[PDB]
Amino acid sequence: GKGSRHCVICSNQKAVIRKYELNVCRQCFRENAANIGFSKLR
């Protein structure tokens, strides 16, 4: 189902990575891993 997410970075349903209370676009997520602490695992 695709109309209730409204990306909190971006208002978006599309482009937003749905993961763990986050609501950022895929790009936005790619931008953010450092301040958060995610480093490549694979």
Added chain:
Amino acid sequence: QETQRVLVKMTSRNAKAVENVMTELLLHARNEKVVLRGPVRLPTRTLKVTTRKTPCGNGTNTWDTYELKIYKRLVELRAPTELVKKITSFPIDAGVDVAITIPH
């Protein structure tokens, strides 16, 4: 004495920062009546994120994965509460959640 099992639990965004934390407080608290049975560390929890990258339209629809492991250190003390509270006067940094609990 009427000890308190104090559990000071330290969970941290890296192992790094917290060990520094852990140690120093304990050193500080100890000296002397603070009496501790050695630090046990519960499972490092891991957060995984794989993303669809690229807006290939055309070109490879290939995908990339970032991770955050989160490190848990516990030390238990059979110690005085006021003394605990006396040493507990450390403002401490972030990335190191430190919880202190008094069960038995």
Added chain:
Amino acid sequence: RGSGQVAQAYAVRQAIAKGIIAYYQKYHNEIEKAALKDKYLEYDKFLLIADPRRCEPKKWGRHSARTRFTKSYR
């Protein structure tokens, strides 16, 4: 406790072997400790080694271990 059912077996024996010798270092002396071991090693199913894995980290993209989503060529 352990599947790896077999891998468990090989584990058991290994532990067993370990049991023999440790008991023996204390409860005997070398020549029997050494023979027991020798004889054991001689017919050993991996007392001191690992079948290092079971079941592999995927290859993402393909979602596999060596292989690969078909190349559909054209």
Added chain:
Amino acid sequence: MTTYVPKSSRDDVYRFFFTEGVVSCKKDPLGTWKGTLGGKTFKLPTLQVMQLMRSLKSRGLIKEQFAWRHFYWTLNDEGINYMRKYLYLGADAVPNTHKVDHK
């Protein structure tokens, strides 16, 4: 811009913003099983605030700063004069210039 909801809100904003000197929010339309929210940083509501603000900002006088849907509102020199007049009180408006303990 048009509203029939106006000056009271206009006052609410100006004053509250002026006393502090600032307001910051999260840009919002109200939602966690909501009804007393109005919007945050005011008891007022986001529609009125946003629209009224759009007026205020759009002719200079006030700053809004951006990041990730937020508006960090800082009241400007001209704004102090205006809003001091509008908030009918002595020349030498507080807003962002009170800084004895830094704000």
Added chain:
Amino acid sequence: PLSKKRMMVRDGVFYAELFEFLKRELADDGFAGVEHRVTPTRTEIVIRSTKTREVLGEKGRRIRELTACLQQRFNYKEGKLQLFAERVEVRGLSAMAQAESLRFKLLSNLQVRRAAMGIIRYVMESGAKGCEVTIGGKIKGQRAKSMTFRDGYMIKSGTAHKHFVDTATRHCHLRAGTIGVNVKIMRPQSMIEEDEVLPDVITVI
């Protein structure tokens, strides 16, 4: 409040969110960064901006605006937050500030390759061990172009790269288009406490 995974998450995010806000805001103070000490009774924020005199000042200077802002924003009851300047010395050591500066050079309609090349000489002179600056964006009545601007070395293979280069990207809409100033500053590896014994570092007694 949040649970433990999430607790960390807020903090990570909190760090990002602030960092961005300040980057936009402290455009004219050479935003280089913040540090957050969550503290007893305070939320402490130390200001690495090059122009921290000017971030400081008096009357309303930045801090004043910010404190209020941030409170209001972050759902503070006032004043449970404190910002402190950081005199981030030798202002040329920063991709961020320099990007911000460079952005301003571009904004200051400086000739670009000339600018970059000067600034990098300043950046390097301010101790950068390398700098690499890219001008991506456009040319012609409108067609696209890029050009590369390096000085020093850059660290182009391995983790140390990650250790050693700081970057900052900016978009300038000029006659039209988008131009990307995209900054890499490589500091020297006399990083001391930030470690020095790098991949290669073998050195004899």
Added chain:
Amino acid sequence: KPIHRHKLEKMRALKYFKVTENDDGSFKVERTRDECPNPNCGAGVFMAQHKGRKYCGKCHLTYTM
């Protein structure tokens, strides 16, 4: 779209008040129509008289006469 929202004409004044000299010392109120309690537009409205109901066109009360 071209529009202007339905209203009742209001040109030529407010003819809902009616006090006189002989109202003075006998009546203070003297208004055309019946009154409004329960509106949040309080005691100044005199409801719509319409079909045996007194209606409040703002505060939407149904009142009866």
Added chain:
RNA sequence: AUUUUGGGCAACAGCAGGUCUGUGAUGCUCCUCAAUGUUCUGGGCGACACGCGCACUACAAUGUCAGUGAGAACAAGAGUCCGAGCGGCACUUCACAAUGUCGCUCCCGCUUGAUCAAAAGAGCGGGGAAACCACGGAAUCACGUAGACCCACUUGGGACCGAGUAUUGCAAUUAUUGGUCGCGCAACGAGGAAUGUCUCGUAGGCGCAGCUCAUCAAACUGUGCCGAUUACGUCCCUGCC
């Protein structure tokens, strides 16, 4: 014992690729409200001659069925925010409704003990905050042992479907999903010319985490359980320096 392991990182140019489907990066270039804005409503992209691309499954004793086996990976989950539910209060109120407040339980996420049912399904009381403490001392899939089929569509197979009950959702009505019992012998007996990948507890099978997620994956990204030819060369082919 080999540039040891799997990765991660990684030069330089290069490719109007793709990138208007992120972008609160945007040229130039459009509508701006009798707009293509915005909401709302309702629809659609999901419509079946067909041509494909992946996947998945069956065709089956090497199996299917009935039962029986003391098999754990790896890894989830309880948001905030003073008319949700509940409650108290407040005031209105002949009685209602009302409104408002406050508080709880927070618009209360995983969930356990277990009763009553064909059955799925209905439930007091409990319990657990990512918790190695409750859902985790059980309980992971193909194992191994006793029983139907004396290998024939046996029904292999279930596409196919019919009432029937439960659940999702504002809404399924382009059946949300389950459930149930019947119920099938569709195709399908392993697939041509072609053809795809692959050389270590691994191929590969086999299964399970984890999220998309109101509700729903054969996807996604992992986890496991089980468990191997010769190749180790050659440089042909086919391709890169």
Added chain:
RNA sequence: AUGGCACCACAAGACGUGGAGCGUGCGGUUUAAUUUGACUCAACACGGGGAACUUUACCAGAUCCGGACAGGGUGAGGAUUGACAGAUGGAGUGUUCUUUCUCGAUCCCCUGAAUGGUGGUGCAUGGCCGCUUUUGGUCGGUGGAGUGAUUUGUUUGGUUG
């Protein structure tokens, strides 16, 4: 040519597609809509695409404006919000209206201007990302060589993967 090198080399083979049935994706093929991108490897479970609405771009219908800021005029002896009840709404939205009371400039109106816009181009463009190419490479410096481009270095021999 030579010398290597690689399981989208091959090679031993190893399993499997293809045919089948089911799906999704795609092509196609209707519509009002089927937003489209993207099609050798490097489209084609990709488009963070696991579309009920929503999503979503598209249709149809319908109101809403969030039409900033001016200029000017209109507007409170009243714009107008709001509206029962019906009338007219998909629709107890007054949308519109009869009716009429609320309500109250915060109006409307134009004349400028203006914007939300998932409104277009990705050959107009950053950024980003795919591909190059998974390839072992790349330099410049001074020095050298050559008129030059250029070149060397940096390779002929060994060794290395």
